[PDB]
Amino acid sequence: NDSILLGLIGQGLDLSRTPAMHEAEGLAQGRATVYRRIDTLGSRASGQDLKTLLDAALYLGFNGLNITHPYKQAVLPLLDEVSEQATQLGAVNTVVIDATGHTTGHNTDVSGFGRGMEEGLPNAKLDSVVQVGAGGVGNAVAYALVTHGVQKLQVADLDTSRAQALADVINNAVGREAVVGVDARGIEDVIAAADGVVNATPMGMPAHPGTAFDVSCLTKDHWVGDVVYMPIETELLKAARALGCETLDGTRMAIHQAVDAFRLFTGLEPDVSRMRETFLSL
Amino acid sequence: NDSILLGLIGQGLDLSRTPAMHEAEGLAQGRATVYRRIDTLGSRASGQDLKTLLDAALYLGFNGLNITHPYKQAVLPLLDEVSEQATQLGAVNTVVIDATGHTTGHNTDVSGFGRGMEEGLPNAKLDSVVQVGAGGVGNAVAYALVTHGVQKLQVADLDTSRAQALADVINNAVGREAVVGVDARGIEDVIAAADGVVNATPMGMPAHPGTAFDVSCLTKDHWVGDVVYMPIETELLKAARALGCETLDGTRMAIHQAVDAFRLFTGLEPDVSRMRETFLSL
Ligand SMILES: NC(=O)c1ccc[n+]([C@@H]2O[C@H](COP(=O)([O-])OP(=O)(O)OC[C@H]3O[C@@H](n4cnc5c(N)ncnc54)[C@H](O)[C@@H]3O)[C@@H](O)[C@H]2O)c1
Ligand SMILES: NC(=O)c1ccc[n+]([C@@H]2O[C@H](COP(=O)([O-])OP(=O)(O)OC[C@H]3O[C@@H](n4cnc5c(N)ncnc54)[C@H](O)[C@@H]3O)[C@@H](O)[C@H]2O)c1
Q1: Residues in CB range of A207: below 8 A, 6 or more apart
Q2: Which candidate in A123, A212, B125, B235 could, as Cys together with B195 as Cys, close a disulfide (CB 3.0–4.6 Å)?
């Protein structure tokens, strides 16, 4: 029944649903919980280096942090220890801070997305999958996919440097040639031949309306995932549903990254349904 | 219903009752509240300067701090603004942090002790009072006394430099010669002639058993106060009670400094009875 102190270091955090999820679940477990935005574009932490903010959290009794863009790679060398998976991906989103200020990095984007696939696509065929988008979120998603039984993942990005760098990182992490960079041009025919496809681009968001590829390449037998969670039903997922495809919406990763982080931070077993209800209520 | 984040910068804080008081009252008002020790002898904040710790609180979203020994004077020049009373005493125990990291210093030791006198000694005669002890707590107590209608306060300390420096500070703060330093040797006869006496020394504590002066100098007509709050009934207050004297125990200031700080930090009206019950429960 000791109180819990957490925060998120990142940029442009006002609309994040992560603080609310953690504050509600700590309270539901009888533990007063504060989860603060630490926004380097905002009114308190502007102009401060990542190491200053991390050090501050240590000194003033935080039990953990999340880390988001543009800090998930930069944070690694600052930490005392880093999980195998976070090390091999080269990205940390969760920092557990023990009673002395010792830090351990983890990656709950990877574990989160993996859990979403178990929960939402238990019967999906995983032999051949396409992922469109090789940014930050895409890096974690690809890792999750190929450690969760995807045999061959083809990753396309408008920026070829990003897709190949992704492939190299993941293949090293898993010890086999699981991932292949492919061209974005003509991606539809690649998708058509695969078992499933995941959008890991901004397409579908209000400010990026549409889809990353022509949905006419989908068939009823495909499964389709999307990282975008606002709106939950993206134009891509609506097209997929219209055909009868199984779909994996973006709220599953979003919720599970927080479930997994709360467990890491506190040692408590989070209630997934309550954290899901918090998320959807915002 | 925004969560509240507070802490205490000081040394040797494990047994402080202040965190528990604030965490309980925030929760009773429907506001998840974390109040962290920031102990420069402890496992997280050792070796760090006061300015580093204050800055850290700003960056990571604290709504306020308390400040205790040896930092209540040192903190003043670090703050953006300081209350009249805290300025004139030269000591701050409460720092309100607004939404940008702007800081205002206050002194709730002074307001606390004053409120205790109103609550616990409403009918006391205040023409002539003696205070034994001119350290930190004594400085706040003396200020409270002479702004709350004490005409002449005689302050004794084994260290004469401390009693005279106190007198000079307070007399400047209040604009009259309210306080006079007197010798500790022979203080009993000075007490005997006065209306009331306040112990502001460590005497009475478990590790400092006894009294700061011979209690035989007391009469039934005196009132007697003590800053020591463990034990609540000090040897001094037991002697005073034996004669039928009105007494002011040290828990009143301790509780009220926290009541007044919580009001400052949050804008909420604290429930004195609940914060008193938290204090006594520890
Ligand atoms: N569900 C969640 O938990 C969660 C969390 C954070 C972000 N997101 C979502 O993930 C999206 C991606 O985030 P990110 O941080 O990796 O963004 P990013 O901008 O770093 O990466 C997106 C990648 O998509 C590529 N891309 C864009 N359009 C493309 C197209 N038509 N074809 C192929 N590649 C294309 C870009 O070149 C870029 O490399 C965000 O826009 C947001 O909607 C979801
Ligand atoms: N009620 C509260 O809210 C509260 C809060 C903090 C501390 N305290 C109590 O206040 C006490 C004093 O704290 P402080 O920080 O000012 O301590 P301090 O040690 O800075 O000052 C105490 C002063 O007492 C003087 N003194 C000691 N014995 C004396 C004697 N026999 N005659 C005359 N002077 C004597 C010392 O020379 C010293 O200047 C603490 O020991 C603690 O019990 C109470």
Answers
A1: none
A2: B125
Interatomic CA distance for residues B154 and B130, integer angstroms: 5
Cβ atoms of residues B91 and B140 within 8 Å: yes
Protein fold of B107-249: Rossmann fold (3.40.50)
Instruction: Copy the structure tokens of residue A280.
Output: 């959807």
Q: Rounded to an integer, what distance in angstroms lies between the CA atom of residue A199 and that of residue A240?
A: 12
Q: What distances in angstroms separate CA A80 from CA A63, A92, A101, A105, B44, one per listed residue?
A: 15, 13, 10, 8, 14
State the Cα–Cα distance between residues A158 and A139, nearest whole angstrom. 15
Burial class of A77 by CB neighbour count within 10 A (0 to 12, 13 to 18, 19+): exposed
B275 marked among binding-site residues:
no
Q: Which of B200, B196, B203 is nearest to B156 (CA)?
A: B200
B138 close to ligand 2 (CB < 6 Angstrom): yes
Beta strands in B109-243 (DSSP E): 128-132, 152-156, 179-182, 196-199, 223-226
Number of neighbours of residue A229 by Cβ within 10 angstroms: 18
Q: Is B158 exposed, middle or buried (0-12, 13-18, 19+ CB in 10 A)?
A: middle
Q: Do domains B1-106+250-282 and B107-249 have the same CATH topology?
A: yes
**Residues of A with catalytic roles:** 72
What are the residue ranges spanned by the domains of chain A? 1-106+250-282, 107-249
Joined together, the tokens standing for residue B102 give 């702007």
For atom 9 of ligand 2, the residue with the nearest CA is B228
Cα separation of B158 and B168, whole Å? 17
Strand partners, A30: none
Distances (CA, A) of A76 to A81, A93, A193, B269: 8, 10, 38, 44
H or E element that contains B260: helix B251-266
DSSP letter assigned to residue B33: E
B1-106+250-282: CATH class? alpha beta
Whole-angstrom Cα distance, residue A157 to residue A61?
41
Resolution stated for this PDB structure, in Å:
1.0
Name the interface residues of B facing A (CB cutoff 8 Å): 3-5, 7, 23, 26-27, 32-38, 43-45, 48, 52-53, 55-62, 99-101
CB atoms within 10 A of CB A212: 22
Q: Which atom of ligand 1 is nearest to the CA of A109?
A: 3
List % helix, strand, coil for chain A (3-state, nearest 5): 40, 20, 40
- Identify which of A157, A126, A146 has the alpha carbon closest to the alpha carbon of residue A85: A146
